[PDB]
Structures are given as C-alpha cells and as structure tokens.
DNA sequence: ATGCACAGGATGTATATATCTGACACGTGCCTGGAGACTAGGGAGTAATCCCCTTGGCGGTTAAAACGCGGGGGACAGCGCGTACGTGCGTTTAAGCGGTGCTAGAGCTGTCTACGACCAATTGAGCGGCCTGCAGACCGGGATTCTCCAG
DNA sequence: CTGGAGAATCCCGGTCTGCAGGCCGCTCAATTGGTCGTAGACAGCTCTAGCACCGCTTAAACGCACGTACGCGCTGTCCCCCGCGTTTTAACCGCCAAGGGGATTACTCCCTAGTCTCCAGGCACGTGTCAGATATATACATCCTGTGCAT
C-alpha cells in the first residue's frame, strides 16, 4: 500500500536553510527516524504530564513543559520561542 | 601551682607530662574536692594508704585517653612553671640521647 | 471559502493536520487541544532545521553538495547539545569522530 | 550451523579496535571480544525473535530488530524506523 | 640493501586514521550472517531473515564494539599502559552496568 | 617508658567500612543539605516552598548516587594498582558511565 | 551562602566508607562536592518544572520522584 | 445470584477488577480483553510472593519478625534475576551489601 | 478523600508465604511502589506491542509477550506459568 | 638449476641471496622469454652492458619486495643444489663471525 | 642479629537482661466501586489468492585471512624516597530537638462557559509511478608528504 | 641538525552510471461548517503544613601534632606483539530457479464497550498489645607490641 513519511517537509526545510544542497535517501531515512523518535518522546512526556495532573486533554502547555523537560539548555529555549510564535500566529489568523 | 582545674606536671620514671587536676585531697577529713565540693572516697574511687594521708591529686594527663586518670601524691606532682618545662625538656633530651645510644 | 491548511495558517513547513491525527491515534490522551499539534510541528521543524543546517555546513566543508549519513553524524557529534539529545542513538553509516589520545602520539 | 563465532576473525577485531583508537592489542583480547559479541547478539536476537513470534510470522524483519534495539536503550536510526 | 620497515606503532596510527575516517562495515558479511543464524537457531527453528534485519544487526553490533573499545582504551591508559587487556574490557563493561 | 596505644594506618578505615556497610541511616547532615537544596533551587524559581518528603527523597537519591559513584571510583583506583582514590578516578568513572 | 561547604569532609568520608573506599586523596572532597552539585541541579530543575506545570508553589515529593524516574533513577518508598 | 469476585474465580489474591479498571483508564489501547487483567494480576502476585519470601528469609536471618527496607534490599540484591529486574531502582533506607575488595584487606 | 493501594493484597501474600512474619509501613510503601512500577512497565510494553501489530485490543497474549520481554530468565518462565494457570482456571470456572 | 620458475641463489658481495627467476635471456637473438615468450628487449627493460651479452636472468628476491627485481647473469646466479645451501650457510656463519668481531 | 612463633594488655564489638513505648495489627461503620444482566456493532478470526523476496546452488576472481619470523619496545618487577595521608586528642561549632506562632497555599466544591469530539460534503495535498541528467565513484599517473636512517 | 630514499597519500583530469529530483495522475485524508455535551477555568472557602524564632545540649566537626606506608620516579630484563613477505581460503559477485509466506480482500460472528441496578470489599478511623528501641552490664574476638628460638 502507501506509506507516509516526513521526506517532503524535511526537503522543504533543507531548501530553506541550504538552497543548493541535496540529500541522499539514507540520510533522509535517518532524518525521518529522528523526527519520529522526537515526536514519540515529546508525545509520551506530554501524556505523562496530563496523567499526573488528572487531565484528559493534551494542550500546548503540556507540549511546552515536555519540550523543557526533554531538550537541553539553549535548544529548549529556542524551541519554546518557536512554538509560542507559531501558536500566536495560528491564533491571530 | 596546685588548684582544681589548674595545670600541673607529673613524673613517670625518667619522663614528665602535663596533667589537669580534678580532685584535690585533704587527708585529715579524708575528702577530695572535685569539679565537674568536698566529697568522701567514692564507691569506686580509692587511694593506696601510702598516699591517702598526703596531699594527693586526681589528674588526667593531656594528650592521653581518659582511661588513664591517676591519683598521684604530692611526691611527683610539681607546681606548673617555666622551670618545670625546662626540666621537661631536660628529661626529653635524656630519653632522646638514651634511645640514640640504644641504636647508635 | 477555499481550503487553507493549518500549516500555512501557522507559517510552518511541517504538516499540522498529520501531527494532529498522529496525536489522536497514539492513545496519548482522551482529547487533544487545538494548539498542541501546531506547537509540536513548530518544535519538530526547528529541530529538523538545526540538524539540517549543521549537516549542510559539514557537507560543504567536505566539498560535496549532498548530505550523507556521515555529515549528519559529524554535525550531531560536533554539536554539544545535539550530542546530548541523541546521546543513546546510533546513526547508520555515520562512522566516528577522528579522535586520538595524546599519549599514543609518536614521541 | 556450528562454530561460526570463529568467523569473526582477528583482523576484523583489529580493525574494530583501530576505529576505536586502540594502538596496541594484547593477544588475549580476540576471544574476550568474541564472547562479548556473542552475549550482545544473543540479547538482541532473543527480543527480535520474540517480536517475530508475537506477530505469528516466520521471518525476522528489520523493524523487529529496531524494536529490540530500542527496548535495550540503543536506538538505531536509518533502518526503517 | 635494507628492507625499510617502519617502527612499531606508526602503521597502527596510520590505520587508526584510516578507519576513523571511513564508514563502511569492518566485519565480513557472510560469517556474521552465519553467526546470526546459528545464534537464532536456539530460539526458533526454520527462521527466515530479511537482509535489512541482518544489516541492522551488523550495524548495531559494530557500533557497540567500537564504543566498547573506546572505553577499553581509556581504561588501559588509566593503568598507565598502552596495550589493552581483557581486564580493561571487564572493568569497562562492569562500570557501564553490563556486569 | 610509657607508650600510647594507636592502631596502624588502615585498621580504623576497615572498621569504618564494616560499620557503614552494615547500617542504613543517611550520612549527610540534614540542615546543611536542606540549605544546599534551597540555594540550588533559586536559579530556577523564586520563593519556592518545599515539602519535607521532597528534601528527604532528594537526600536519599543523592546519597545513593554518591555511594555508587564511590564504588566505581574505588574500582578505577584499584585498576591502576593503587588503594587511594584520586579525582582522575572519579572523572574516569563518570566518563565511562556516560555522564561526561 | 557557601552551602556546598556544609557537605563536610567527614560526611564525604562516610559516603566513601559505605562505598568500600579505604584511602582518600585530599583533592577528592572538593571534586565530590562538584559532582554532587551537578546531580542536584539536574534533578531540582526537572522537579521545579513539574512544580510549575501544576501551577503550584510548593515542591512535593512526587515531583522529585518523577524527576528521578525520568532521569533513569527510580526511587521507592516515597510514593 | 450473589456477587463473586473474579480473583476468587481465578484463584488469585490481587484484585482483578481493579487491575481491569487501571488498564481501561490508563490510555494503553482502545479495548482491553477479558483475560488480560487476570494474567497481569497473576504475574504481579507471583513477583510479590517471590520478593516477600526472600525478604522474610532475610528478616529471619536477622532474628526479626517484621520486614524492613533493609531486608528487601538484601533479598533483591542477593538474588541475581531480581537484581537485574530492579537494576535502576533505588530502595530507600536499604543500605548496601557488605562487600570489601580483597586487595584492601590486611596482608 | 480515600487513596487506594495494594497493601491488603501484599499482606495476604505475606501471610501465605510467611504466616507469622509482619511488615513495617516503609517496607509496605516500597512494595506498593514496586507493584506500581511493574504494572506500568508491563502495561506500556503490551500497549506498544498492540500498536506495532495494528490492533485495538490488549489481550492476554500481549501481557504474556510483555512478560517474556521484561522478565529475566526463570522469572519469565514462572510468571508465564502462573498467568496461564490463572487464565485457565478463570475460564474453566 | 636454471629454468623459468625455478629457484636460484646468487651472490651480492660477501653474501648471497636466494631468488626466483622470471626471464631467460638470449644474447644471440637479443630476446628475453618470460612467463605471466621470445620478445625483444623491453621499452623499460634493459640489462647492463657487461651482462646483456651473456646468459642473464631477471630474478625476484625472496623476503624482499616486488620492486628489487634484478637482472643478474651467470657470473653470480649459481646452481641451487645441496652444496649451494651449504655455502649459503657458510657465508651466513662468516657474516655472523664478522658481526661478533664488530661487537666482541 | 634476623624471621619465625606465643603472651598479653587495650580496645572496640557482640550478648544478655530489663523496661518502656509507639507502631503495627485488628475491629467497626459505610459507601462507592465492582459484580450481574443484557444489547449492539465492529474488531478480529478465517479462508482463498498472489507474487514478492528469501533461500539455495554453482562458477570465477582475487581480496583478505592465515602463517612464519625477526626484533623493538612495552610490560612488569624491584628499589629507594619523602611526603601526603591516617590516628588520636583538645576545642569550637552548630546540628538536633522541642516549643510557640503565623499564614501562604494546597486541596476541595460549585457554576457554567467555552472548547473539543463527531459527522457530512468538498477537494487538493501528498503518494506512487516514470524518467533522466548530473554528482559522485572509479580509475590512472604524476606531485607532494611523511617517515627513517646514516652522517 | 640534514640531505636523500622509499613508501604512502594527494591531486587533477577523463569516463560512466545509479538515483535525486522533478513531473503527472489520482485518491483519500485534511478542511469546512454546524451540533452538542462536558472538562476545566474560575471564584470562594477551609485548615495543613511549611516557614520562622528561640533556648539547651551535646555530638560532631575542626585544628593540629606525629609518624609511616604508599605513590611515584628510575632502572633492568625479557617476552610478546608488530611490521612484513608468502601461501591459502573463502568472501564476493553474477546469475538463475523454486516456492514459502506476507500482504490483500471478502465474510462472518462473538466479545467487549456501554448502561442500569445493587450490595459488600476495602478504606478511614479508633484501640490495645508486644516487637523493637534503649540502656546498662559482661564475654568474646582482634590489634599490636614485647617475649623467646636460633640461624
């Protein structure tokens, strides 16, 4: 059947940061595995946070707290700023 | 010189050591005065007869464990002075030279 | 009105709708808020951008126009915080960092 | 299939140690390395076969190995994920 | 009329640099495949194997062994030696938690 | 001629190793560790209150971690034909554990 | 303010004795303090994170337990 | 008819209904089978029985009638498989096993 | 309110294995933590197994496979034996 | 003794080295025969003029690398026989004696 | 005068008895969470099909493994030194405990509002299949670097 | 230092090819719009426990003297591992052929979620012993230095 992956979005981001750089299929598979692994980590931590506090909903606050718990130092602050910016832009428009 | 809590010196063979007094003896009343106070000989405190009738002192030696407290009569304990420390060094050098002769 | 994707609404390259579906299908919670997929997609996009930029630098340093697993490994292991994040991860066909102890150098 | 651990030869272990930064290797290292590799492979393959058997399959897939490696705290990128 | 041999330890550094730059597999493939099948023989009979599963097993095993040698080298240098010995491997695996 | 009694170097040490490997009480003083915890918990948030069990759990975990790190340090020191632990032993133990 | 000096030399010595260490260099104690401090930070930070997600101002035992569990150090006897 | 517990039917001491509720409400899957809580309760009871037997042995070797954390630590750390199961677990007020390296002994 | 635990069942098991040995409160708390930890590990592994095979139900086969994956050596064999015996007795009755 | 593929043992100063042959020369026809072959002198192959007119052979030495191939004539290339091995050991012994005289 | 082997005083550890307490075990009320009964529909079990990909075989080439050997340099053992540890005692310090007091904030309850599940129609983003030009791999031969040794 | 020599590596053209990236048809999952129920946001109350202060008491930390055993530098021997040439093996590639089993699709049926009613298992709280704590008063067992034997 049909299998889905993050390849097209990884390629979009790569052409954003390095417009004259390509990528091999093995490297794209590694990047897809990386995205899936990070998704699983953040989602599992957010689920644990929701369960600890007697909540049924996973909101953006749980995602932010999970990002602060799972990312080190400057990565966490930059990711939190990016997520807040994205949520603000989504709510305004 | 000889007071409760004051420093005193004490002989032992050819050497001498500094001690602290805790019980001063009065034989005619058969009582020692102590600091944590005229009190009689206790259920475990006792002095031999050749020193129980003289001015005795229950002392604890500085630099030695509290299990080696000694009831010394007026025969060995002297008044704490600098000349006594000079004699301390005299016997210290005596023992030093004695051991150096034992070896060399 | 014509359909407008949530990714374009939030200004992101990663699919907000697919992230929302995966959050709903993963038995993470009973319900999912509206801003959670947007936040998660933004975070994933930022991390992808970081690793891709470092890997592109490492590929241009080696004088090539494509990123291979070796360049990803170099980028990750040379960056301290990415090395901390992917500390228990093995990148296939990535090799190792060329480090030699000083006591083994010829003297 | 018997005595295939001796197919992991001394030159191969030497190359693996060179990539690790090792300059001089005692002669008693190769057997210890074979034993360590056997232990690691047994621990991974037990879980891989457990995953294969739970699915009522007869062939071990790459995903079974990936899940076995992940369960042991060794995540492997680039083999299907 | 001299054979022109290198001093003990310079070829070792040369191949350290050679193998810390490449990324290919260092073990032969057929012997490792036979070893994997022989080990799996004791868990289930008549097992089949995708080639990518054996590839993943080999990648993980070589990464593990290279990392263990990197720890063994530190353990040996700690004893003020240059040669790695089995006790170095044992100490490394014990401190990791595997023993 | 009087000599004072004193054990040789390495006897009281073994006596203490036997004493402290037999009991289970905590070894760090409580108020100093509580002050250390409260000071460290100030680069993160201001005017933080603490449950007593929180500090108790922190002390348990930190002492268990230190004891295990000391065991690894002792193994590292012995590996170098020594009986004295040095900071390089702790550094090597933490490097091999993955902390460095 | 120097609360890391409150972890005194005898206490580090007791920890080493429980760890089976016979002889201790003089430079160990300071080193030990450093290590301890790092560990505490890595825990306390995470604990406070939980304390801030629940909109609480008091750090509870369960926050410490969760931080320890997520750092790979499971603790029994506190809930 | 009169109410009969499921643990009694299965011959268990651990609550099958409570385990079933904890499985349903724990966000593990959409559906939970009928024989899953019974299996899980049996496994939990077996592990509890193993640990309690070893800890009671340890408490008797110390001539005590009550199990304290020290006995649990001794039981877990002296058993190889139980020590592997609780490898990354810290038992509070449990202490350590009495072990002195040979080279540190007086020779 | 009221907080549930496993104390009574652990006490019953203790009185079965050592019918004259008691237990303190701290040790009982440790046993409760142990039971919760094992429950969470097994349930999480079973959920992962169910998701891997595209199935919505956690059956006893998922529990058995999770027990074989998480317990070492003889513990896995004995636990599987107890689980199978309990399931057979529950279905037959 | 002397054939393509056959062994030979040739002098080099006060010692000898054993080699394996690959080319047989013919000065009357000025052609060498080799094995992977009557062929004219090579574009990179040549012989010194003192042995190009004699029975020369292109030898590769044992224990030496593949680059020390030498064109040696019948002046040094001797017949590999029992006496040849004996005199090989003989000059080896004399070399050992000379080294010991250099040392002791 | 030196390694062996006892005697014994010192000292800190384990045993024995005795008294007291507070922590565990047991008993009672209640209430809510589990058990019994029943329905519906969808997830899973089963049977047939296919075609992919896994296993198996065989021949040729040559890369890599195996093997033998001389020699350097690294492992290791012994020795001498001095100093940085351990031990123990007198002194200073602050921890530990019990007490009194205050209030910030954890925990719980009631209301109702906004947010998220759910469903039906629309459709375009994304997946699959196909193709092709170029980035990279592979040569090969000069150029340049690195190591070694002899002077 | 310091030229040469030999080997290893680098570099720069020239050729060839697999796959990276772009295009295309289609379909199924994302979007839009409207309903509706309930999760939690929010405001208010209670009363728990966390923070603060203070006074005694004594265990613990600290400073310091003294000495000895251990870390470390140095030296000498020898053995074992490395560099390297030669012979042997089997890994790798290529090519093909058979069929096992994993994936797919249809059909059905039973098993689990949902709902209601009911009642007893478990939990919260109140009491009362007795296991463990704590204290004091004795046997052991080691540690260690001074005895002798005599080589």
Q: What distinguishing features does this structure have?
A:
heterodecamer; A: 93 residues; mainly alpha; Histone, subunit A; 4 helices; 4% strand; globular; B: 104 residues; alpha+beta; seven-stranded antiparallel β-sheet; 2 helices; 7 strands; elongated; DNA-binding
DSSP helix count of chain E?
4
CATH architecture of chain A: Orthogonal Bundle
Task: Determine the N-to-C terminus distance of chain E.
Answer: 54 Å
Total beta strands of chain A: 2
Kindly state the percentage of residues in helix of chain A.
over 70%
In percent, how much strand structure appears in the residues of chain A? under 5%
Termini gap of chain A: 37 Å
Note the overall shape of chain A.
Answer: globular
Note the overall shape of chain E: extended
How many β strands of chain E by DSSP? 2
Strand content of chain E: under 5%
Query: Helix fraction of chain E?
Result: 55-70%
The number of domains of chain E is 1
Domain Core Histone H2A/H2B/H3 (chains C, H): 1-77
Organism (chains C, H): Xenopus laevis (African clawed frog)
Subcellular location (chains C, H): Chromosome; Nucleus
Domain Histone H2A C-terminal (chains C, H): 80-107
Walkthrough of the structure:
The complex is a heterodecamer, with 2 copies of chain A (93 residues), 2 copies of chain B (104 residues), 2 copies of chain C (107 residues), 2 copies of chain D and 2 copies of chain E. Chain A is mostly helical. Helix content of chain A is 75%, strand content 4%. Chain A is built from 4 helices and 2 strands. Chain B is of the alpha+beta class. Chain B has one domain (1-95). In chain B, strands 1, 2, 3, 4, 5, 6 and 7 form a 7-stranded antiparallel β-sheet that branches. Chain C is mostly helical. Chain C has a single domain (1-107), classed as Histone, subunit A, CATH 1.10.20.10. Chain C is built from 5 helices and 3 strands. In chain C, helix 2 packs across helix 3. Chain C is elongated, with a radius of gyration of 19 Å. At the G-I interface, loops of G face helix 2 of I. The structure holds a DNA duplex (151 and 151 nucleotides). Chain F: Residues 9-96 form the Core Histone H2A/H2B/H3 domain. Chain F: This is Histone H3. Chain F: It is found in: Chromosome; Nucleus.
């Amino acid at each position: 059947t049909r299998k889905e992956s993050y390849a097209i979005y990884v390629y979009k981001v790569l052409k954003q940061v390095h417009p004259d750089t390509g990528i091999s299929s093995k490297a794209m598979s590694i990047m897809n595995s990386f995205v899936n692994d990070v998704f699983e980590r953040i989602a599992g931590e957010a689920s644990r946070l929701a369960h600890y506090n007697k909540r049924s909903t996973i909101t953006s606050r749980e995602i932010q707290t999970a990002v602060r718990l799972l990312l080190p130092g400057e990565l966490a602050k930059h990711a939190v700023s990016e997520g807040t910016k994205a949520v603000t832009k989504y709510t305004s428009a | 010189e000889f007071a409760l809590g004051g420093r005193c010196l004490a002989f032992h063979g050819p050497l001498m050591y500094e001690a602290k007094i805790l019980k001063i003896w009065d034989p005619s009343s058969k009582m020692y005065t102590s600091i944590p106070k005229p009190q009689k000989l206790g259920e475990d405190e006792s002095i031999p007869e050749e020193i129980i009738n003289g001015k005795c002192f229950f002392i604890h030696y500085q630099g030695w464990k509290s299990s080696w407290d000694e009831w010394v009569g007026y025969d060995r304990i002297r008044a704490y002075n600098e000349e006594n420390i000079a004699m301390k060094k005299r016997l210290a050098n005596e023992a030093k030279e004695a051991k150096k002769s034992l070896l060399e | 009105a014509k359909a407008k994707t949530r990714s374009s609404r939030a200004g992101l390259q990663f699919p907000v709708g697919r992230v929302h579906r995966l959050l709903r299908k993963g038995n993470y919670a009973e319900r999912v808020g509206a801003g959670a997929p947007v936040y998660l997609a933004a975070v994933l996009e930022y991390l992808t951008a970081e690793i891709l930029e470092l890997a592109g630098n490492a590929a241009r340093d080696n004088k090539k126009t494509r990123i291979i697993p070796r360049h990803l490994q170099l980028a990750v292991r040379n960056d301290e915080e990415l090395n901390k994040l992917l500390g228990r991860v093995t990148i296939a066909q990535g090799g190792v960092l060329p480090n030699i102890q000083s006591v083994l150098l010829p003297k | 299939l018997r005595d295939n651990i001796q197919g992991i030869t001394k030159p191969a272990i030497r190359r693996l140690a060179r990539r690790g930064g090792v300059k001089r290797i005692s002669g008693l290292i190769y057997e210890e390395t074979r034993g360590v590799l056997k232990v690691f492979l047994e621990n991974v393959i037990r879980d891989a076969v457990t995953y294969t058997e739970h699915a009522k399959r007869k062939t071990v897939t790459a995903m079974d190995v990936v899940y076995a490696l992940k369960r042991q705290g060794r995540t492997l990128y680039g083999f299907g994920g | 009329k001299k054979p022109h041999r290198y001093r003990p330890g310079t070829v070792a550094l040369r191949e350290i640099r050679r193998y810390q730059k490449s990324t290919e597999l260092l073990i032969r493939k057929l012997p490792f495949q036979r070893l994997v099948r022989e080990i799996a023989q004791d868990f289930k009979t008549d097992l089949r194997f995708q080639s990518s599963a054996v590839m993943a097993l080999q990648e993980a095993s070589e990464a593990y062994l290279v990392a263990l040698f990197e720890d063994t080298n530190l353990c040996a240098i700690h004893a003020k030696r240059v040669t790695i010995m089995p006790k170095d491997i044992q100490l490394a695996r014990r401190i990791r938690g595997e023993r």
